[PDB]
Design a protein around this ligand. Structure first.
Ligand SMILES: *[C@@H]1O[C@H](CO)[C@@H](O[C@@H]2O[C@H](CO)[C@@H](O)[C@H](O)[C@H]2NC(C)=O)[C@H](O)[C@H]1NC(C)=O
Ligand SMILES: *[C@@H]1O[C@H](CO)[C@@H](O[C@@H]2O[C@H](CO)[C@@H](O)[C@H](O)[C@H]2NC(C)=O)[C@H](O)[C@H]1NC(C)=O
Ligand code: CL
Ligand code: CU
Ligand code: CU
Ligand code: CU
Ligand code: CU
Length: 497
């Protein structure tokens, strides 16, 4: 069952074997992925997170981010450690109490301390719309239509050796999959459909790193939502989904009753499907319980291309229809060298005092804020443009902005901007060498909002900045509860800081 919008959520250590290999993990709700947290648009979520972690090899502190939720007036509940809070220490709990006005769609939640979400603290977060404009396009939309794509590692995240390449050991679809090496015939996930019905499949990348080429043999997929933003219908036969992105698509169960492979090919790790790696099963009711015998095409006919997506609503693009046509036009210099990423020459290292607390304590320009050179102020009620030119090693990098979604004025692999009707989303691939992926948004949400690559290994290696949006109004806009005020003293005492 789904939990929420008011729920406890316990964070524990446990052994799991999602690909047949046992390792310890950091889990929400006792499972990988964690339980779906759900409610309706506009609801008050009160998620009391109980940190019960005891194994230091995966960190005993935690903090949880609710990915894609804007947190307007509740920046303190956003979750990124040392940006909006100190971590919750073991044996303590913290109530993330926030509202979701004006949002409805497919989201997720994850640890936002170090690389801890890779160790298992990841799960779906759905905000249903009772008056969804896409409601008539499908029959079924429930916990059984959520599809998570995850990378899974045999080596613990804190134990990945310095200087060696990090790749995953399995792709997990709905928590199950097979290992790329020493493959065993462990159970595959089954997604069940009834012939003739239409399903809102909510595809969630909970990846720490790889992008996936997602497809379903014999079927096509009609996209209706992108990162929480309703889209015009776009029929595709393959979706390249980057870390932290979401799509909803209509699946029409219009093929013969049978078994069909679900495929999720990562860009690193095991290539292909030998032994049933990178696979799950779409099973029609009344089909034999057996593996599919279908194949993929050699070449997909209608892959998703981001510039083909358009909002369902008339969202437009803020600002003026040319490069630099914004109140605050930025161009970030995104680089990598010698194991560290940097933005405008500064590698992100989390500060001792969370950025929000520094602001509440009276630091009132971004040059006063730590880490020095990592916090950029944005003015209020302004159109912001951020160009994110690619080229840094380890791409393609999926950049994500907290507190906001944004118009994708320029997408990967296409030099032409779109100032008319591009999709809006919250995580975007910046593409390849020579690209100039560019985003726009308006600043109507005071607080410090993280901007970073969502490949968690890259975030850990410094690929981030903080946008201190409307510093002057941050304190008045974001009243903080006593429990939040208690986090830093508790954390610093526990850690002898
Ligand atoms: C990406 O687009 C930005 C603008 O959004 C470009 O920025 C300009 O860069 C030149 C030097 O390269 C400066 O003279 C301008 O002041 C910048 N702003 C403008 C023209 O609006 C940037 O060069 C582009 N990058 C790539 C790699 O194409
Ligand atoms: C590259 O991106 C541009 C901009 O998003 C795409 O151009 C649009 O194409 C649609 C469909 O033909 C037209 O209706 C729009 O008028 C175009 N807009 C602009 C600003 O040119 C273009 O299709 C993309 N290229 C590819 C190969 O997909
Ligand atoms: Cl977010
Ligand atoms: Cu996220
Ligand atoms: Cu986020
Ligand atoms: Cu990256
Ligand atoms: Cu983040």
């Amino acid at each position: 069952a789904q939990i929420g919008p008011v729920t406890d959520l316990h964070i524990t250590n446990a052994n799991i074997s999602p690909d047949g290999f046992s390792r310890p993990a950091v889990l929400a709700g006792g499972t990988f992925p964690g339980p779906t947290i759900a409610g309706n648009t506009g609801d008050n979520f009160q998620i009391t997170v109980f940190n019960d972690l005891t194994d230091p090899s995966m960190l005993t502190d935690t903090s949880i981010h609710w990915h894609g939720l804007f947190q307007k007036g509740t920046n303190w509940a956003d979750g990124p450690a040392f940006v909006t809070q100190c971590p919750i220490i073991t044996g303590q709990s913290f109530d993330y109490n926030f509202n979701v006005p004006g949002q409805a769609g497919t989201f997720w939640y994850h640890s936002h301390l170090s690389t801890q979400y890779c160790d298992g603290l990841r799960g779906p977060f759905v905000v249903y719309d009772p008056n969804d404009p896409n409601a008539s396009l499908y029959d079924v939309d429930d916990d059984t239509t959520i599809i998570t794509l995850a990378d899974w590692y045999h080596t613990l995240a804190q134990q990945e050796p310095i200087g060696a390449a990090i790749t995953a050991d399995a792709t997990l679809i709905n928590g199950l999959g097979r290992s790329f090496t020493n493959t065993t015939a462990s159970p595959l996930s089954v997604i069940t459909v009834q012939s003739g019905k239409r399903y809102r499949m909510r595809l969630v990348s909970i990846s720490c790193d790889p992008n996936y080429l997602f497809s379903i043999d014999g079927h096509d997929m009609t996209i209706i939502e992108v990162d929480g933003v309703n889209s015009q219908q776009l029929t595709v036969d393959q979706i390249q989904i980057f870390a932290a992105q979401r799509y909803s698509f209509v699946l029409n169960a219009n093929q013969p009753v049978g078994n069909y492979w679900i495929r999720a090919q990562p860009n690193s790790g095991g290539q292909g499907f030998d032994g049933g790696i990178n696979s799950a099963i779409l099973r029609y009711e009344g089909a034999t319980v057996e593996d599919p015998t279908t194949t993929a095409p050699t070449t997909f006919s209608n892959p998703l291309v981001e510039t083909d997506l358009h909002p369902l609503a008339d969202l437009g693009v803020p600002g003026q229809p040319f490069r630099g046509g914004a109140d605050d036009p930025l161009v970030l210099n995104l680089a990598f060298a010698n194991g560290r990423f940097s933005i405008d020459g500064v590698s992100f290292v989390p500060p001792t005092v969370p950025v929000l607390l520094q602001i509440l304590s009276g630091a009132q320009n971004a040059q006063d804020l730590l880490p020095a050179g990592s916090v950029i102020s944005l003015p209020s009620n302004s159109v912001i443009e951020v160009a994110l030119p690619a080229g840094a090693a380890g791409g393609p990098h999926p950049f994500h902005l907290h507190g906001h979604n944004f118009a994708v004025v320029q997408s990967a692999n296409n030099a032409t901007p779109n100032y008319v009707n591009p999709i809006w989303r919250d995580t975007v691939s910046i593409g390849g060498t020579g690209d100039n992926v560019t985003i726009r948004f308006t600043t109507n949400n005071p607080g410090p909002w993280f901007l970073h690559c969502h490949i968690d290994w890259h975030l850990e290696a410094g690929f981030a900045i903080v946008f201190a949006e409307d510093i002057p109004d941050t304190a008045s806009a974001n009243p903080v509860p006593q429990a939040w005020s208690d986090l830093c003293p508790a954390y610093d005492q526990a850690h002898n800081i």
